[PDB]
Symmetry: C8
Subunit: 246 residues, 8 copies
Amino acid sequence: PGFLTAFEYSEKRKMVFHITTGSQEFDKLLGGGIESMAITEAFGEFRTGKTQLSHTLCVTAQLPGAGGYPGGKIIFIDTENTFRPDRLRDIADRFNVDHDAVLDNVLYARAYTSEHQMELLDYVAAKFHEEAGIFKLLIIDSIMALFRVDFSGRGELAERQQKLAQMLSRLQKISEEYNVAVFVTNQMTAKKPIGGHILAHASTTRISLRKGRGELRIAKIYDSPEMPENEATFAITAGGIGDAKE
Amino acid sequence: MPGFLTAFEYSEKRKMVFHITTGSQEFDKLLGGGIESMAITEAFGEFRTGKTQLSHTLCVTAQLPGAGGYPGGKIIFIDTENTFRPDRLRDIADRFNVDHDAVLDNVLYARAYTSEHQMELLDYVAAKFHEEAGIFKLLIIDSIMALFRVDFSGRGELAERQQKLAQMLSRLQKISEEYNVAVFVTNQMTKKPIGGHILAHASTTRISLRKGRGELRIAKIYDSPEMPENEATFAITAGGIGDAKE
Amino acid sequence: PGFLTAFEYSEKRKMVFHITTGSQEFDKLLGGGIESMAITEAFGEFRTGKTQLSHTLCVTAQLPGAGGYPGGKIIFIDTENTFRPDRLRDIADRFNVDHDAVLDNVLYARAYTSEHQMELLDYVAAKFHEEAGIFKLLIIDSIMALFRVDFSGRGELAERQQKLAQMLSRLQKISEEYNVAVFVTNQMTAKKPIGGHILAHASTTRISLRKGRGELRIAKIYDSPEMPENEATFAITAGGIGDAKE
Amino acid sequence: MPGFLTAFEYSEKRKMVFHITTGSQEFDKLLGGGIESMAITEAFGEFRTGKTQLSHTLCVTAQLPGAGGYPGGKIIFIDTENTFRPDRLRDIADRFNVDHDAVLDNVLYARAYTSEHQMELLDYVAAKFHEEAGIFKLLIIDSIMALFRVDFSGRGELAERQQKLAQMLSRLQKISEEYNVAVFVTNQMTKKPIGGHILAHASTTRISLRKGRGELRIAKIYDSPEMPENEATFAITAGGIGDAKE
Amino acid sequence: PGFLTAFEYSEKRKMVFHITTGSQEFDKLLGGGIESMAITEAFGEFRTGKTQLSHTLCVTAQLPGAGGYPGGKIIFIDTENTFRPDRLRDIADRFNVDHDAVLDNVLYARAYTSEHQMELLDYVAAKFHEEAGIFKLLIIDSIMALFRVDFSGRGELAERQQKLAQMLSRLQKISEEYNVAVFVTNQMTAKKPIGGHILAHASTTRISLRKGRGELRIAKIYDSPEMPENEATFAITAGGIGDAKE
Amino acid sequence: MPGFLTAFEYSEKRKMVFHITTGSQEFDKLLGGGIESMAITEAFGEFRTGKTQLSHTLCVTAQLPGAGGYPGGKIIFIDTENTFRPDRLRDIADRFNVDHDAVLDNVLYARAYTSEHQMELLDYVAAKFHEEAGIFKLLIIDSIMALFRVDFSGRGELAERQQKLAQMLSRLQKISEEYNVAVFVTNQMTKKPIGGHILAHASTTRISLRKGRGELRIAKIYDSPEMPENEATFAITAGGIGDAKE
Amino acid sequence: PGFLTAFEYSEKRKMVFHITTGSQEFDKLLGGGIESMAITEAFGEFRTGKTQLSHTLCVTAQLPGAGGYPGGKIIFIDTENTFRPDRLRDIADRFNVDHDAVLDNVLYARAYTSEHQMELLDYVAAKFHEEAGIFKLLIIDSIMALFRVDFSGRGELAERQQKLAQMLSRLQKISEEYNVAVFVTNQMTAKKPIGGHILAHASTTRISLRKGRGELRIAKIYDSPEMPENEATFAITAGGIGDAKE
Amino acid sequence: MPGFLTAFEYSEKRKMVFHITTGSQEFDKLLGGGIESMAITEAFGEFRTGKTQLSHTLCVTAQLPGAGGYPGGKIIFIDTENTFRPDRLRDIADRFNVDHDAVLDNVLYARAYTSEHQMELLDYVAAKFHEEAGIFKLLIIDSIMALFRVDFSGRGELAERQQKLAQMLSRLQKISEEYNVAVFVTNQMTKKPIGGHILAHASTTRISLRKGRGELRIAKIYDSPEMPENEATFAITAGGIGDAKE
């Protein structure tokens, strides 16, 4: 009655996969990469790597990977007007895969309001149902910019939080029922990530991105102790997220 | 009387109270034998303090014959954090020299995505325990009110949050005491544990977990005087909660 | 018309009795012990003697005592999940009375909500009516923990105070109409006892319990001048509330 | 006129005003003879300042022929504090050399458990005085508004508290002045007496009681200049309120 | 149309009279005494002369006086329970007039609520109409103690001010239509007189009373410059308000 | 146009504007001739600054032929302060060598007891002026908004106070400008004059009155720079407002 | 569809004209004078030149001027009761034009309420329609004094701002549809001009007027950098706004 | 999918994105070529920083064939500030050696007088673009939300202001992206730009304009680090926005 045995749940989790970020150290930080049946959130300031990571995953999710990962299709929801297919050209070149094939395997939609964003996710649930195992990654860049927009006054916050919680619980269910990785970007405020308890709870992994030495970037697990193991160095290139020169 | 028992009848009922070993002798002594039936035991602390290791360890130890005539039984696990991992149970089962698949078959598992969902799940749990009493010995809720923080984050709805929270916890008390099961729940901090008077009253035993020297952990009775007897040292391994190797 | 002569009231008060606490000095502090036709409130921190006193009275109320007190039955309402018949075994042993007889003379009920607690007290009024003089003591441990639980927000206090006042006025009437002692425990807050004017007015005697030297305890009349006569020393043993070594 | 008397008619009415001795000559001088009829006299102070001794002493002295042609009469005692004790009246009766049972037969007594109950009782008192005027000489309310504090403790209902309180006190004034009885009431402090403008206006005389040297007490006119004539020393004994033995 | 010529109004004002206070200097301060077609307000602390002045005017208003004043009857409204016909005996003795005659010419009523006080004033308007020129003085001791009583919370002030303004405008109309002096007493608060703008506007003359040397008193025009002409010394005796020894 | 005049038609209307001498040459120079028609002139100040003397003096000077072809006329006086005294007009008439009864016949007088009454009176004034234009030259309101302070003293009704006040003052402006009468009003201070923007806008000229050296007074244009031309010295005598005898 | 080509709009703007202020430097500051198809706002303290400028424009708007300006008629809305045709006599004399002709070309109306002011502007729109090109200037002295009057409390501001915005948008439309200059005066507050964003946006040019040396005045563009080019010196004479002696 | 495109289809759509030169090479480099289509570009700054010169310059440059295959097209200009001046376009057209009347015929222009009017105008714009796509290339809104400040200036209506503002800006985004037009808007500051999160999110590029040395101006990417590449120097001439002559 709404319950599985731990054995049945184990059978379900044996299908969990990781999508490489393109950086070895970053993957190790994540235990292999962006994990399915979970929401992974990346937040930071501008030029920390959020967009490069989103675009890189658009390519790596289509590639055969570790643990028998066969690759698959991607859904990209864009609230920021930042998706640029041309970036995928350089990234696909790096990974030696055809441009048009990469572009044919990414489905894309702009969201202009928070209500629209929620409608899109209902469409996404239907598409994942059409045939499971085809799509492996859902990207939302970004997760709640539109919720700040649509409920900006300090009197409408109750409805904002309710709508946000509803969307995120549906996003959790989507990730876990259909065995897809959900990657989302988020903004910061006076810094801390926005969304409060709701977004903190919904995300299974939260990554703070900041600038490193020169052109290097640093990824860290948010609210984790200040220790090196909880941090990873990566570089940004025309080929996407990658490893430092070394 | 209507709704009253004699102290003798109640004594007969309490003679069947049991404890489930935590895997640590010192922790068990602190608890008077382990996680106690006809009661709610709450464990709270920061990240990597032992909450998840204790939850998973209890999934195995609740199935083993133990002290005080404890015969072992089945477990129900409600997961609000997306943290349950059967593979941890395999390592802990190895430690206790018991079959993996048998351990996994004896744990019923459900994710909760909203506070309303969590309460519905607990109504199903009452039905399951009732189907045949004495089969299930442990109900785990990891965690008890993260979803109430989520669903009632803006103030002005706090009254309804407190009412729903109190209602769930009074039902939990009645479940633990009517069906003689131990209820183990985890909780977050904000440091002091969240939940205020409601959760403080509902729990019969409250445990703060914190990091000790090196890889050791420390369990303490919350709101108790600063004295050694109210504290216990334990260790965390791939085999679960255990004793320090001194 | 709702009035008695002072003579008739005197005839009524001539039946007032005291139930020994088990401690001579404590009894002297109370004028003989826990007094009938009145509410006596004991508050303090943990391990001050509240539970030991409740359990001790479960036995002493059944014993013949000073002033021709013949002993009688007890009703115990438990909001804290702290009643333990096993404690009564040691206390009965101390007073050389049979265990099963002691347990048969105590009626017991858990209250899980404040509304439930009030319903229980309405049942209690009916039971006392069935035959007066059978029951001599009503214990409520504790008096208003559940009222803090059920009305925790700062907007529901009006209804909380009204419900609390209603319960306590009925408790006063129960104690005085049926000539029973009412003993209740209470918590403290930033320390002072909770309940404010309502509980202060309802209780005829209020006792602060605190830790003394070593294992000794101290009982005092709350809000009374700082003088020795208003204080008493007692000890806690397996046999319940008792006198210090001396 | 309609509702008006000539000063002569009012003079004839006031010629029947009487005083009830407090048992203390100095206290009586302070009051102009004792507790005055056609008026409310309020006594307030801390614990063990004399309020209860004065209430009980008046239960006896109101029955004795006295100065100014006072013939003695019966007493009504409304008890909100659970403090009335006929046995005190026996000791005070002994002092004044009068029979116990006669003293007790001449005092009518009722407990009030709510403010609404207290007001209902006062309506019955008006009826009783009316049954045959000149029989009752004293109405005691110990205490006047503890129950109003209880029944309206949260703010927001303060308006209704003040309205009910004012209504009761205007009725009390009319009772004292229409039926030529002295009204004596006790009150708490919070230091200044509670009740604000309403109780200040309703009472014709207000007395603060405080502790003097050793076992002596001091009565003072409230809000009066710091001068000796506005103060009186009295003593408390088993025989009630009396004069200091200097 | 609701207007008189200044000539007709002059004819009306030619009938204005003064009632001596009993003190020569006090009368000079007032231009002859208490003036008709006007409200005169006296405020101060206790034992400043308010009651002595009220009682003195009860006698002097009946005496032939300066400017052809023939004397007349008085109406006394008592909100404070302070009117004492016996004081008039000594005052009448001073002025060598019969006691019973003085008492027969004063009509008296207690007011127990502010609504009652307003009803009484409506009765007074009717009585003055029965035959003008019979009554010369209306005393209200005090003017708004009952309005503070009936509207004590800070939420009912709107209705309080409206009722107070309505009463005072009717009082102005009574004084000016029927050519009677209206004398009222008032309390002070943190000192300043209570009533604010409403009472300040309604009163044509306002008098502050304070204690002078020894048993002397001082009357001053409130809010007037600090100069001797705006002040007068008077004495209080068994014969009422009078002149200093000198 | 509908509701518009040519500047020529308006010029013809303004050619009939007149001034009423204050009795003081220097005051008149300050005002450009005296109290001006088709305008409201407001005078405010403390007690005994000249407001009442000016009001009464104008009652006489408005009846005298004067400078600029002023022919004299009748006066309407609305009295909210109970300060109008025809006998003052007799002394002022003596100064100007005119008959008393003629002066008194030419002043129409009414008391206002409420703000609603004051507004009703002004509607009657509009009717009277209309009965035959050119008869009345001066409308005095002493004072303009004391009764609005009275009738709306508690906040929360301030909106209605401001609306009623604005409505009365716009009617006053229209009365002054439609019927070519001077409107003179007195006002209180709280220092700055009360009435805020509403009264500031409605008045065309505002005069502050204050005490000068010895028995002299000073009139000044409110809110004007500190310069001598904006000030005038005048004297007060039994004959009214006059010039200083230097 | 509600749009013009830039060419058609150019044809419309080619008819834009300027009305000289009477001061050469002031005109240069304005680019020729008061500009049509726009609102020009002048604010300042008293005696800064607002009224002199209004009256001067009443004459100069009728005079042939630079750029082929033929002169025309004027509408003057007066909320302050300050328009004086006699001033125009001296100004017309300066410009050598007949008095009666100047006065016949100015239409005039007083506004007594803000609603009235808005009704007047609706009449004005109709008059401008009767035949375009006849009227060249609309003066409003002042623009929103009556809006402060009619909405003075801090609770009615929403409706005030809405009404003010509505009037000003209609005023913009009037100026631009009928090719007329709109000149308005405004007050200042704690200094800054009143009206906030609404009036700031509606006005195309805003002029601060202040006192200069001796009798000279200074006009500046409000909120512009502190530089000489943004300022102009002018003089005030019986002939209106003019150039300094030099 | 329903509402989704493949990345390839979206790539084909973005291949038609164009840039409109600002007239300044350095400014263009800062913008990646100029004002970009399928996006909103916002420029804000103080007075005389270049906002109006840029708006007018774009009216001409949008009509010229340019880099990246830009063919030129028509412009829609919505004017909330009353600042559009075709004569400026004549000077700028001269600089670029193009006919005046042709330039003016290719700009459609409308004033907005209210925020509701502004939104209605944008609905007409959507219709016009749709009449035949590819004709219009640029929509200018000068300025974007001055009228929203005006129409919702009092707080309490801020919720509705934010909702209307968000709705307009989401429509603007959809207009820019559906019909492949560049949207250029100006904005005020209060220093930081007004509009909060809503306007920050809606604009894809935000430019702060400030004054440089002498007559130079500086354009910067808002909220970007203090670095030279994020800034550009340009000059303002009668010919519009141009490069500095160094």
